[PDB]
RNA sequence: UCUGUGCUCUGUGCUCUGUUUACCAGGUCAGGUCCGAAAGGAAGCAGCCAAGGCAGAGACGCAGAGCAGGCAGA
């Protein structure tokens, strides 16, 4: 798909292609599109239906005047894509009350475990809160053991049996546990070996009505994809507040038909997170997804960052002595970098989403980040001072720096200046 | 002149306190770097510590000098 999103700009070609009629470049990028989905898994009965809804429209319709056509279309299409997946429900992933019951159903496994991860992961990233976890699975190995792992080295524990082959007590055991202990969210994966799904879910039966779990969730790979649907679906019945999210992205190639059949069931995620890494997971909204021509945008996100810093130097001490009185050093800019990744310095998100304003070049981004760390060598490799005074940067004084922070000089001279043409150029106003 | 008396001045030794110090033989060395397939090692900037610089204080040490009722002994 991925490369569809393209056609993206790949429209914003005034020039059109040879058909005097330009007037194909549409059909063309819907069948187009329209190819990309199918061959990536995606169902098709349904597909009609949009490719339809679509062409409805048109011949009832057209962009209110002061507005380019081609534009328009899209929100259409962007505005049916959305539809065509999680048309438009903004799941509700948070606390109806504290502590939590995440009873996790899945097939067989398959982020059956994993996943749990960075979810809990996530939510220990967020709130005061005490998440807490419990291998819910007993006819598969690894149960705690490959999860285990993390839990600590993420700074969570949870809980299991070994060996010991029977849910429920454990479950229950667990559960109040934390509970005794009164923190606030639980997450526990379970599944079960009966050969059918109907008995899948058979399992999660007493499961569920033995615990009386509030939020629960299901779960799939887009390995299984559009035929997953019925799985889940058979389910959206047995529980309706039954949310899911497919396990991943990055693990498949055939998405689409996953996440498509879902919806077309009333079905309800909320995240999908790409694959690997305790991160990679992402909360849901189509649109989110899609952001950025077909799915993921940020920055907005990286951008309002930027609020994040510009606004609190303001933040040393806003004030902290109204005027100008020269109280604090300019070494942010290295300080910009921590932050970031400190925390949220991954890229932030510098992509560039739509070179707009102005579209100029391949490096850019594209050529630094990945290892925009280098800048950073140094710095750390210097006095405080330095970098208040930064012309003050003799041969001698620097290839010290240089050494020491390991660089063979030129890497610093070339950058010594991306810092005072950045404000030559930066400080610009008027 | 020496010594005591104490007091003062000056130098300094030690201590306490404040402050100050990119690199130019201290310690610990994040980050980055280097060697190694790894196991493991190494050099090392910043910071911090030590140390140095500048000061105040010690009716604190060691000294030189001076001292109406300066006063004493030799």
């Given at each position: 798909?991925?490369?569809?999103?393209?056609?993206?700009?790949?429209?914003?070609?005034?020039?059109?292609?040879?058909?005097?009629?330009?007037?194909?470049?549409?059909?063309?990028?819907?069948?187009?599109?329209?190819?990309?989905?199918?061959?990536?898994?995606?169902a098709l009965p349904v597909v009609r239906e949009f490719i339809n809804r679509v062409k409805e429209k048109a011949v009832g319709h057209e962009v209110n005047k002061s507005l380019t056509p081609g534009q328009e279309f899209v929100k259409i299409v962007r505005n049916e894509l959305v539809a065509a997946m999680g048309e438009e429900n903004q799941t509700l992933n948070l606390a109806a009350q504290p502590p939590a019951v995440v009873?996790?159903?899945?097939?067989?496994?398959?982020?059956?475990?994993?996943?749990?991860?960075?979810?809990?992961?996530?939510?220990?990233?967020?709130?005061?809160?005490?998440?807490?976890?419990?291998?819910?699975?007993?006819?598969?190995?690894?149960?705690?053991?490959?999860l285990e792992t993390l839990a600590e080295q993420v700074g969570v524990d949870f809980f299991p049996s070994d060996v010991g082959q029977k849910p429920v007590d454990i479950v229950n055991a667990a559960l109040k546990e934390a509970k005794l202990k009164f923190y606030?969210?639980?997450?526990?994966?379970?599944?079960?070996?009966?050969?059918?799904?109907?008995?899948?879910?058979?399992?999660?039966?007493?499961?569920?009505?033995?615990?009386?779990?509030?939020?629960?969730?299901?779960?799939?790979?887009?390995?299984?994809?559009?035929?997953?649907?019925?799985?889940?679906?058979?389910?959206?019945?047995?529980?309706?507040?039954?949310?899911?999210?497919?396990?991943?992205?990055?693990?498949d190639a055939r998405g689409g038909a996953a996440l498509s059949i879902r919806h077309i069931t009333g079905k309800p995620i909320k995240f999908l997170g790409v694959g690997e890494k305790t991160e990679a997971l992402e909360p849901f909204h189509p649109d989110r997804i899609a952001s950025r021509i077909l799915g993921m945008g940020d920055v907005l996100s990286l951008i309002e960052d930027i609020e994040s810093k510009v606004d609190r130097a303001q933040a040393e001490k806003l004030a902290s002595k109204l005027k100008k009185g020269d109280g604090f050093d300019l070494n942010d800019f290295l300080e910009q970098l921590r932050q970031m990744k400190n925390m949220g310095g991954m890229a932030s998100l510098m992509g560039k989403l739509p070179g707009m304003g102005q579209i100029p070049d391949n490096v850019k981004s594209q050529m630094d980040d990945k290892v925009l760390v280098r800048m950073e060598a140094i710095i750390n490799s210097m006095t405080m001072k330095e970098r208040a005074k930064p012309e003050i940067i003799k041969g001698s004084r620097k290839r010290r720096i240089a050494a020491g922070c390991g660089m063979q000089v030129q890497d610093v001279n070339r950058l010594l200046k991306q810092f005072d043409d950045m404000q030559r150029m930066m400080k610009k106003m008027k």
């Open positions: 798909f991925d490369n569809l999103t393209d056609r993206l700009s790949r429209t914003l070609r005034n020039i059109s292609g040879r058909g005097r009629l330009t007037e194909d470049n549409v059909k063309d990028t819907l069948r187009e599109v329209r190819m990309a989905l199918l061959e990536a898994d995606v009873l996790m159903a899945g097939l067989q496994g398959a982020g059956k475990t994993t996943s749990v991860g960075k979810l809990g992961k996530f939510l220990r990233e967020k709130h005061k809160k005490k998440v807490l976890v419990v291998s819910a699975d007993v006819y598969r190995p690894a149960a705690i053991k490959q606030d969210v639980l997450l526990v994966d379970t599944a079960g070996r009966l050969h059918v799904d109907e008995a899948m879910m058979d399992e999660i039966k007493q499961v569920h009505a033995s615990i009386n779990p509030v939020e629960t969730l299901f779960v799939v790979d887009a390995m299984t994809g559009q035929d997953a649907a019925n799985t889940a679906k058979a389910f959206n019945e047995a529980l309706p507040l039954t949310g899911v999210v497919l396990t991943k992205v990055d693990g």
